[PDB]
Paper text:
Ultimately, RON13 kinase activity controls host cell invasion by anchoring the moving junction at the parasite-host cell interface.
The canonical HRD catalytic triad of ePKs differs in RON13 with an HFD motif conserved among all the coccidian orthologues of RON13. In addition, ATP hydrolysis activity was detected. The catalytic activity was completely abolished by introducing a single amino acid change (D595A) in the catalytic HFD motif (rRON13dk), validating the importance of this conserved kinase motif for enzymatic activity. To gain insight into the function and regulation of RON13 kinase, its three-dimensional structure was resolved at 3.1 Å resolution by single-particle cryo-EM. The RON13 kinase domain is similar to ePKs, but contains an α-helical N-lobe insertion (NLI) present exclusively in RON13 coccidian orthologues. The CTE is mainly composed of α-helices clamping the kinase domain C-lobe. Of note, the CTE is essential for RON13 folding and stability as neither expression of the kinase domain alone, nor proteolytic cleavage to separate the kinase domain from the CTE of rRON13 yielded a functional RON13 kinase. Of interest, three autophosphorylation sites were identified on RON13: Thr379 and Ser381 within the NLI in proximity to the ATP-binding site (N-lobe) and Thr703 closer to the activation loop (C-lobe).
Author numbering: 280 to 300, 307 to 784, 791 to 1186, 1201 to 1258, 1266 to 1310, 1319 to 1332, 1338 to 1349, 1356 to 1375
């Protein structure tokens, strides 16, 4: 362990730790000495982007001969400084060009803005008195700070030509100071940590000295800084100031849709999305981007002292280089905007964007000093915004519309999530008690943001992003640690995936520090170049997840703290003034044990131990005294997490004992499980205490795990049915109703259990339950293989094919539309929302999952459809049945310009049809309603009949319409429903009789018409309460049953 004592002091491959904690004119005069160039308004092309301070222009007819020697490739673009605020530049233009402006644009707001902006002109500086002298040598800037306030500004009709230059040059001056404050800090670093460069800059340079910094910032560090000081000459001889920035494709933030027909908000025709949609949809490109995106900020924080305090998707710039033939697509990323950058541990000003502000900046932090932990939060949010983008892109971020705001609305009179309430000094805080818990839950495994992630995001990245966005300022990992783990995983994944460059890849891998410690800790050898190292990459990537689960700390705490006997949680009163407290003197014995276990009985110094814990766990030395306290608190309450984990997994078995065909378990707890568990254990905890919240937190955490086990067992079945035709034979045997031999069932279940491991491998490097987990599940991992094979594979054995899943869902969506009489909205998002929120109550069969708590795995498993395709599948069914219902009533009124107000000429994109199918589907609906009407007559009689329906933990009564003749008898009445039972979905009820009872059954000689209302229709078996009339397509449909 010789590399730990700060061996690489200024390297950019693995920077050192963050150990511990100028005039104004100097910073402006530093960056003001950049090369100047002049070009007219003819090399500039069409405008390409516009902000609040400037407009960017690409330059045609190449110019700026300072470039020909400069950076190869790397197209350029100027930006003219043009203040956009209350249309005052437009007013200045209309006055200068000629004519008189309107009095409507002038009076209150424009004059207010000019009055506010002519003051605060830094007329003291000597740089601002030369910037204005170069652009216009006739204006005397010392009279304009006086004329604005002596006589109020209404001389605007004669001072426009000067006000323009003054204001735009003040904008240029601010943007120049923003870069000077960085050139200063870069020079302060090149002195101490670069001997080769500072032997040719310190000798003699002032402009080359300031161009070298820009070259270093663009090429080495991946920032984006200005390179020249171009001065543009207009057609009317009015010079504007500008800067020569680099040109990217830019703005990793995609555009949203506005027509309302896209079920993921992606604008289908934005032109700039076509490439972004290729990045945010694949797994390899996203794994590469995640590691490429941390480099600039790691460099910025650990090498130089400054920090970047406005991180958000619009501020990151990209460059694609498609690489179609003979090469590969190489993505490049840079950091854009440097408006708020400042030295670390210096005083700061609260100015950011609200959705990305750390919660510890809310009231105060010693006057809000600039801490390094404010930047790790904003990258966790930014990266989570990239992994959930191809699934439900919205205009507002997920953690504020699903996690923060519905919590803020409940337990306070403060629904205002604004910046004025965030910055204010007086009032109720914004992140006080429950909003912090909601934010913590939002990113953990099972929350909303975590429900929206890609299917292919490994568990290591999920855990790391969950640890970077931690509301607690301590116990939050640093940027160096994140860079290490993400880069190591990207390298290992590219080695594993790919089938002369292997040598360079292996050297670049083993040159890291995290990998060298992992090789020392796993007892491994310097790997190879001529050996198949597959199982040695499998171990380095699996040992990198055990440190995210925090397994070494748990193994060190298992040997120190005892488990707090079970007679503590049942034999104590006053449950509001007791709480499991950690001694504070054992959180030190566990740390000593951990140090000895990790170092392997060598003797490190203190700096080496600090560096090692920062590399491996990513915290300070007084920052692991909270990680360790969490672990030993979780170890004290053993024997209560285990009893809870065992109380559930019997609810999961009762679910299959009561409803023997469910098709999912649906991770979110059914809100009734808590009362089952609290009564199962015999507990009585006041719901507002350290133990009531603990119990409600553990019940859901165990239910999510058991639902995950169920889902993996259901995916393995569908994977093993795709191969091994013998498995398919036995599966069809099971489904058809009969039963197979014993050895055939054994082979079937053995194949499914062998496929469980193939399914579990991708996201969890190994099995799902293959870690120390006996408080999460109720079963130690040694007895977990023998539970899934013998017990759980019998629940999920007979699972309906996909066509049946789609048919019953279609028929349950076409009943909700009859149930609710109102019409449907205009945008398909709202149609889906209403139809799928009113579905559990008005449908006979309950859906497998609820609205808002839906996932991509559920849909891809049950329906073979992604989430934005599942929603689009539901909306079309809804709208088409709406059109059918509208045509039926109109055909009824006629003894057709009498359709409702928004169906006379609808766009065939509201349906799924092409433009040629609507005028035929209407004719089909007409030809069908004609028969539905011809049904009615004097002889026929219509009524409803009662059967058993949904199974609530006895059954509901469910009544279905019937139409028959008066001549019919019970003889011919029972035979029809017997023949209907033959096509049931439930394989058990394919052999039943379907008598009609009153429960005294009726004589077969009686008539049916005089009996019609207490009689019900039951299914009895001829050999020996069931609801297996509900599982038929005749009883699930809308049309009435025609008994005939």
């Amino acid at each position: 362990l010789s590399f730990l004592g700060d061996t690489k002091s200024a390297s950019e491959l693995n920077p050192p730790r963050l150990v511990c904690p100028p005039p104004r004119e100097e910073q402006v005069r530093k960056a003001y000495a950049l090369p100047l160039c002049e070009l007219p308004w003819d090399d500039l092309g069409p405008m390409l982007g516009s902000g609040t301070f400037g407009r960017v222009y690409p330059l045609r007819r190449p110019a700026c001969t300072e470039v020909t020697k400069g950076f190869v490739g790397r197209k350029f673009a100027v930006k003219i400084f043009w203040l956009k605020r209350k249309g005052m530049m437009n007013l200045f233009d209309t006055i200068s060009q000629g004519g008189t402006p309107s009095a409507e644009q002038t009076d209150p707001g424009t004059i207010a803005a000019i009055k506010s902006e002519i003051r605060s002109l830094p007329t003291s500086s000597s740089a601002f008195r030369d910037m204005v002298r170069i652009a216009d040598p006739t204006v005397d800037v010392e009279k304009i700070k006086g004329m604005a306030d002596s006589l109020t500004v209404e001389t605007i009709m004669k001072e426009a030509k000067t006000l323009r230059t003054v204001i735009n040059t003040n904008g240029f001056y601010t943007e120049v100071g923003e870069t000077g404050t960085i050139f200063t800090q870069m020079e302060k670093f090149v002195q101490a940590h670069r001997p080769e460069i500072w032997s040719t800059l310190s000798k003699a340079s002032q402009e080359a000295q300031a161009s070298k910094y820009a070259e270093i910032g663009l090429a080495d560090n991946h920032w984006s800084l200005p390179l020249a000081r171009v001065l543009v000459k207009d057609k009317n001889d009015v010079k504007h100031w500008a800067l020569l920035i680099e040109l990217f494709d830019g703005d990793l933030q995609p555009k949203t849709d506005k027509t309302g027909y896209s079920l993921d908000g992606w604008n289908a025709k934005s032109g700039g999305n076509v490439v972004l949609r290729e990045i945010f949809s694949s797994r390899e490109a996203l794994i590469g981007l995640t590691s490429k995106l941390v480099k600039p900020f790691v460099v910025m924080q650990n090498l130089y002292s400054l920090g970047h305090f406005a991180i958000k998707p619009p501020n990151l710039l990209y460059k694609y280089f498609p690489g179609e033939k003979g090469r590969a697509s190489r993505l490049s990323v840079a950091a854009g905007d440097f408006g708020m950058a400042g030295l670390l541990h210096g005083d700061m000003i609260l100015r950011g964007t609200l959705a990305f502000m750390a919660p510890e900046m809310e009231r105060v932090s010693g006057g809000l000093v600039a801490k390094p932990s404010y930047d790790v939060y904003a990258l966790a949010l930014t990266l989570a915004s990239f992994w959930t983008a191809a699934t439900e892109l919205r205009d507002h971020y997920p953690w504020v519309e699903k996690c923060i705001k519905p919590t803020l609305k409940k337990m306070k009179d403060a629904p205002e999530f604004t910046f004025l309430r965030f910055a204010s000094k007086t009032g109720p805080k914004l992140y006080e008690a429950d909003t912090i818990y909601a934010l913590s839950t939002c990113f953990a495994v099972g929350g909303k943001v975590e429900k929206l992630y890609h299917t292919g995001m490994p568990l290591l990245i999920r855990l790391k992003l969950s640890q970077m966005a931690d509301p607690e300022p301590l116990a939050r990992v640093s940027m160096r640690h994140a860079r290490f783990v993400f880069k190591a995983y990207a390298m290992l994944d590219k080695l594993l995936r790919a089938p002369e460059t292997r040598e360079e890849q292996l050297k670049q891998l083993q040159s890291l520090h995290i990998v060298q410690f992992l090789l020392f800790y796993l007892r491994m050898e310097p790997l190879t170049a001529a050996r198949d190292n597959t199982q040695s990459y499998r171990r380095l990537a699996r040992a990198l997840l055990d440190f995210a689960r925090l397994d070494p700390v748990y193994q060190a705490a298992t040997e120190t703290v005892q488990p707090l006997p079970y007679e503590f949680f049942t034999e104590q009163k006053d449950w509001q003034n007791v709480k499991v407290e950690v001694s504070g003197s054992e959180v030190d014995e566990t740390i000593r044990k951990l140090r000895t276990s990790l170092t392997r009985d060598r003797s490190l110094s203190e700096d080496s131990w600090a560096d090692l814990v920062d590399i491996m766990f990513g915290v300070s030395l007084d920052g692991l005294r909270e990680v360790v306290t969490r672990v030993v608190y979780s170890r004290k309450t053993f024997l209560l997490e285990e009893k809870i984990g065992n109380a559930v997994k019997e609810a999961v078995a009762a679910t299959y004992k009561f409803d023997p065909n469910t098709q999912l378990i649906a991770e979110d707890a059914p809100d009734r499980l808590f009362e089952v568990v609290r009564t199962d254990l015999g507990l009585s905890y006041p719901d507002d205490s350290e133990l009531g919240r603990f119990l409600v937190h553990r019940v859901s955490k165990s239910h999510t795990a058991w639902a995950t086990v169920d889902r993996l067992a259901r995916q393995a079945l569908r994977l093993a049915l795709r191969r091994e035709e013998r498995t398919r034979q036995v599966y069809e045997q099971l489904l058809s109703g009969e039963k197979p031999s014993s050895e055939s069932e054994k082979a079937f279940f053995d194949s499914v259990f062998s496929a469980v491991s193939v399914v579990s491998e991708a996201n969890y490097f190994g099995l799902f339950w293959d870690f120390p987990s006996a408080g999460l599940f109720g079963v130690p991992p040694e007895e977990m293989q023998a539970y899934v094979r013998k017990t759980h594979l019998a629940f999920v054995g007979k699972m309906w094919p996909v066509e049946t899943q789609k048919k019953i869902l279609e028929a349950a969506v076409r009943v909700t539309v009859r149930g609710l009489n109102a019409s449907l909205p205009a945008s398909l998002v709202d149609v889906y929302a209403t139809v799928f929120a009113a579905l559990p109550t008005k449908a006979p069969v309950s859906p497998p999952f609820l609205y808002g708590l839906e996932r991509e795995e559920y849909s891809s498993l049950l329906f073979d459809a992604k989430l934005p395709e599942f929603k689009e599948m539901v909306a079309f069914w809804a709208t088409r049945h709406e059109l059918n219902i509208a045509v039926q009533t109109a055909v009824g009124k006629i003894p057709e310009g009498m359709l409702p107000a928004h169906l006379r000429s609808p766009s065939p994109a509201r349906f799924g049809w092409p433009p040629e199918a609507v005028a035929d589907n209407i004719r089909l609906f007409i030809r069908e309603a004609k028969d539905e009407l011809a049904l009615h007559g004097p002889d026929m009689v219509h009524n409803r009949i009662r059967v058993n329906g949904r199974s609530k933990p006895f059954h509901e009564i469910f009544r279905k319409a019937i139409a028959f003749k008066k001549d019919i008898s019970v003889l011919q009445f029972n035979q029809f429903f017997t023949d209907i039972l033959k096509q049931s979905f439930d394989p058990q009820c394919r052999r039943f009789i379907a008598e009609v009872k009153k429960y005294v059954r009726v004589a077969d000689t009686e008539a049916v018409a005089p009996l019609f209302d207490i009689l019900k229709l039951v299914a009895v078996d001829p050999a020996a309460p069931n609801n297996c009339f509900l599982w038929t397509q005749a009883f699930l449909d809308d049309k009435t049953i025609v008994v005939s």
